[PDB]
Design a protein around this ligand. Structure first.
Ligand SMILES: *[C@@H]1O[C@H](CO)[C@@H](O[C@@H]2O[C@H](CO)[C@@H](O[C@@H]3O[C@H](CO[C@H]4O[C@H](CO)[C@@H](O)[C@H](O[C@H]5O[C@H](CO)[C@@H](O)[C@H](O)[C@@H]5O[C@H]5O[C@H](CO)[C@@H](O)[C@H](O)[C@@H]5O)[C@@H]4O)[C@@H](O)[C@H](O[C@H]4O[C@H](CO)[C@@H](O)[C@H](O)[C@@H]4O[C@H]4O[C@H](CO)[C@@H](O)[C@H](O)[C@@H]4O)[C@@H]3O)[C@H](O)[C@H]2NC(C)=O)[C@H](O)[C@H]1NC(C)=O
Ligand SMILES: CCCc1nnnn1-c1cc(C(=O)NCc2cnc(C)cn2)cc(-c2ccc(C)cc2F)c1
Ligand SMILES: [Ca+2]
Ligand SMILES: [Ca+2]
Ligand SMILES: [Cl-]
Ligand code: NA
Ligand SMILES: [Zn+2]
Length: 806
């Protein structure tokens, strides 16, 4: 209950929320049906519109007008944004030549340049080029400031997950806003777009920028505007707040536009009706920039123009219905649309079984437009699993499509022509970033980056210490003229051992055999050199990875490859090798088909054994350094060492063998040599972080050999592909993947066909950042290069998406 019978006089859009429930005049009051009776009257004035006209110039203040053209309006901070232009012969900001802002040019009493966030809903990245004719203010921001060709949203590419990711630097799985709708089984509560539960704070985890600011003594404008508050009034309020006294004035502000998303849903991303919302957004930027110029703040504030996600062409007739696949349709709850999430309709039903639901949805129709996953089998790049609000069963929906439960759900809920929510690597989902101001660079294009990175930068812009988040702090230093964050490399926690030959063959009882007893100071001094690391400069190009946790491991050197071998998990944590453009693929000789060789540098007690693989009828094994790529017949023997062996399902060996036999050589040919680092990943609790030994849920039968949940590879070459990978003088180029180590190839519907038809496609789906592999392994890569560390951080955050040109 609010006894809403006080007044908003002199309190319009007050920055602090009041008790006793006086009645409120802040930004949230409308949402809480708690505004004072006179809120609309005093705070939402509209009389005379939003622009000065020639005849209003020098008028007598009339407090009824929405904005003012009177002589005293500058001191009051409440002129119409075009005042100086119409009344004082000034030019519009957009008409001025742009001039580098080398230092902040701020009025006295400004302790730091303010940050103004101009956020636009559904602003697809290609609008920057495609609508450029109708968006002159935005186009000047972009060409004069710093801009990316696009910015990558988080999954799902919905509004609340993305706005809150922008606010926190966290993946939705960590901040808790994992969709536009959610059920939290612990709370036993539901969250929806329409309604009041969404206002309960218990949904909103992490620490958003306004809270980070406030806790550190930096005041923030409100990050909420009621839908009904017109855009002109939002801008005038921000401009009013900027005229507050030094002790009261916020340092960070947010504007938000519901457009172009709103029209995009109705007309599609490029409907002819879309021109007008883009014009109107541009005009709103113009009003802000004219207003800032009037306050002499246009060379003082940093402005960020930023979208939450893009927009795709989606119509009613492109809907897949679960009723065409499932017989038990009424025993499930589907969260529907551009993603699907399935759970049991009732928990008092023990006849509900996720595995049969998955099986009924798997590759059932030739052109099927969604793919079911258990959430832990989703591509690791999505970081979409570690939250009780994400249902175990998930549907990734093809771009341009919807999934729904039953047809009645679609015609008794074509209206819409656009939607978003799809995989965050989809081109149509990409959004925008432009930074303009004294702290951003001048006329600079930066590479595309992920929106999880912005929180750190916004904290940098405000001199704040960021809360713990998923950005990689320093990876966006190249956006900034000053205020950069000088990251330092993490310290190695475990140093390796360098074992020499310490064991005789007969000490090993591994049930392994090799036809290798086929026999010289030429070739014997040579092999000794290789075992001591003579070729290591060739196969370990960027230094050994650092181990960032406490463990026991050995460096093992070989002619063709180097490895960091874990005595704890009984296999390498990483294996490193370089394949030049000129390298030759050979086959595994017949007599060596089943060969596994004891490693006389490593104890029987810290080795795998062959018997375990014989006994385990499900599990086979593969090698990290591929025998196919051995440099000579004698070097090939190194590849069959038990210390190069890893557990692999036969279904997965089809994927791996094709990667190692065909694709590595193809990349070496295309990129002029590649360095490859490969290894296992263990993430049984699907938190995106390296498992400790006590977290492993599966072992090779009858052994302590842990089964990986994934296999990674990091493939590095020279960005200037005229230089070979092993002799690169400049920036690097990387692509990586994290493949799920699965006992079936159910994920790939074409898997009965030859590997040339489906494997590369699977690998593309499971593309990853080096940074994702760093979290999953506790390793730190690229420690010894000739590059600056900020540049390496940017490289570690790169994702090769395989989408065509935006
Ligand atoms: C992306 O970046 C983020 C941010 O850095 C990374 O997430 C962090 O990861 C840490 C390691 O997993 C994690 O640390 C744990 O936190 C526990 C205390 O957490 C509370 O306090 C913090 C700080 O204020 C707060 O942010 C947390 O918020 C979470 O939970 C609330 C309420 O549920 C939500 O509102 C919020 O959205 C958030 O949820 C998310 O995280 C939780 C896990 O915390 C998930 O369950 C959710 O799904 C969701 O993703 C909390 O309010 C602390 O208790 C933990 O300590 C245990 O383990 C340590 C090991 O060092 C041990 O020393 C302790 O003794 C303790 O063990 C005991 O508890 C065990 C489990 O109950 C039990 O088994 C034992 O027997 C013991 O009793 C731990 O320190 C940190 O909370 C999150 N932070 C955030 C914001 O999510 C994330 O990893 C990054 N992602 C990637 C891919 O890199
Ligand atoms: C709908 C109005 C949305 C809205 N209006 N003005 N700002 N604003 C907004 C909200 C958010 C958010 O995440 N808010 C949480 C929330 C949202 N809704 C409820 C009910 C409870 N809590 C984030 C932003 C944001 C944009 C860009 C960047 C770089 C950083 C940001 F932080 C903006
Ligand atoms: Ca077996
Ligand atoms: Ca884990
Ligand atoms: Cl959703
Ligand atoms: Na298949
Ligand atoms: Zn939308």
């Amino acid at each position: 209950w609010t006894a809403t019978s006080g007044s908003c006089k002199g309190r319009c859009f007050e920055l602090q929320e009041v008790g006793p429930p006086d009645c409120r005049c802040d930004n949230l009051c409308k949402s809480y049906s708690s505004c004072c009776h006179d809120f609309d009257e005093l705070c939402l004035k509209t009389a005379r519109g939003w622009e000065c006209t020639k005849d209003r110039c020098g008028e007598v203040r009339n407090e009824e007008n929405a904005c003012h053209c009177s002589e005293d309006c500058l001191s009051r901070g409440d002129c119409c944004t075009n005042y100086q232009v119409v009344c004082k012969g000034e030019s519009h900001w957009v008409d001025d030549d742009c001039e580098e802002i080398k230092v902040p040019e701020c009025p006295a009493g400004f302790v730091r340049p303010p940050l103004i966030i101009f956020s636009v809903d559904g602003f697809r990245a290609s609008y920057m080029k495609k609508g450029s004719k109708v968006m002159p203010n935005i186009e000047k921001l972009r060409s004069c400031g710093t801009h990316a060709p696009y910015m990558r949203p988080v999954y799902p590419t919905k509004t609340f997950p993305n706005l809150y990711t922008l606010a926190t630097g966290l993946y939705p799985e960590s901040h808790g806003i994992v969709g536009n709708s959610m059920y939290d089984p612990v709370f036993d509560a539901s969250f929806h777009l329409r309604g009041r539960e969404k206002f309960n704070h218990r949904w909103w985890g992490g620490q958003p920028l306004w809270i980070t600011a406030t806790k550190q003594g930096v005041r923030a404008g409100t990050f909420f505007w009621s839908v009904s508050i017109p855009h002109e009034r939002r801008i005038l309020t921000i401009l009013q707040w900027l005229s507050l006294p030094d002790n009261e004035r916020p340092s960070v502000y947010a504007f938000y536009s519901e457009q172009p998303d709103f029209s995009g849903h109705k007309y599609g991303p490029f409907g002819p009706e879309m021109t007008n919302p883009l014009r109107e957004i541009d005009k709103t930027v113009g009003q802000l920039m004219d207003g800032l110029k009037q306050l002499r703040l246009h060379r003082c504030v940093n402005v960020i123009f930023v979208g939450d996600h893009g927009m795709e062409d989606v119509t009613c007739d492109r809907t897949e219905f679960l009723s065409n696949y499932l017989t038990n349709v009424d025993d499930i709850t589907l969260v529907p649309g551009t993603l699907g999430r399935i759970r049991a309709k009732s928990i008092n039903n023990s006849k509900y079984d996720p595995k049969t639901i998955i099986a009924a949805l798997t590759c059932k129709k030739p052109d099927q437009h969604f793919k079911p996953y258990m959430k832990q089998h989703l591509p690791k790049r999505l970081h979409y699993a570690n939250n009780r609000r994400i249902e175990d069963i998930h549907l990734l929906v093809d771009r341009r499509w919807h999934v729904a439960r039953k047809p009645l759900d679609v015609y008794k809920k074509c209206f819409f022509q656009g939607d978003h929510g799809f995989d965050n690597k989809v081109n149509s989902m990409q959004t925008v970033f432009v930074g303009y101001g004294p702290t951003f660079k001048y006329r600079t294009k930066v590479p595309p980056f992920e929106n999880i990175e912005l929180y750190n930068v916004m904290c940098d812009l405000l001199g704040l210490k960021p809360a713990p988040n998923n950005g990689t702090h320093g990876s966006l230093n190249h956006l900034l003229r000053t205020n950069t964050f000088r990251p330092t490399m993490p310290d190695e926690v475990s140093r390796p051992n360098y074992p020499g030959i310490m064991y005789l063959q007969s000490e090993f009882d591994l049930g392994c055999t090799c036809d290798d007893k086929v026999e010289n100071k030429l070739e014997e001094l040579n092999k000794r050199l290789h075992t001591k690391g003579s070729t290591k400069e060739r196969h370990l190009l960027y230094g050994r990875p650092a181990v960032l946790y406490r463990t026991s491991y050995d460096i093992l050197y070989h002619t063709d490859f180097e490895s960091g071998y874990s005595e704890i998990f009984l296999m390498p944590l990483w294996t490193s090798y370089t394949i030049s453009k000129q390298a030759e693929v050979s086959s595994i000789p017949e007599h060596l088909t089943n060969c596994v060789r004891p490693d006389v540098r490593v104890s029987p007690g810290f080795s795998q054994n062959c018997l375990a693989y014989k006994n385990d009828k499900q599990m086979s094994y593969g090698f990290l350094f591929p025998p196919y790529l051995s440099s000579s017949p004698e070097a090939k023997y190194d590849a069959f060492l038990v210390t190069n062996m890893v557990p692999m399902y036969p279904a997965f060996k089809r994927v791996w063998a094709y990667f190692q036999r065909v694709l590595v050589k193809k990349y070496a040919s295309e990129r002029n040599g590649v360095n490859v680092i490969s290894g296992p990943i263990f993430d049984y609790n699907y938190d995106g972080l390296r498992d400790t030994e006590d977290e492993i849920k599966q072992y090779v039968e009858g052994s302590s050999i842990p089964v990986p949940t994934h296999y990674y590879s990091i493939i590095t070459s020279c960005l200037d592909f005229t230089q070979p990978a092993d002799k690169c003088d400049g920036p690097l180029s990387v692509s990586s993947f994290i493949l799920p180590h699965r006992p079936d190839n159910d994920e790939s519907c074409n898997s009965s066909e030859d590997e040339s038809k489906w494997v590369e496609e699977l690998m593309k789906m499971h593309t990853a950042r080096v940074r994702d592999i760093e979290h999953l392994t506790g390793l730190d890569f690229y420690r010894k290069t000739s590059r600056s560390y900020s540049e390496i951080l940017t490289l570690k955050t790169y994702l090769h998406t395989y989408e065509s040109e935006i």
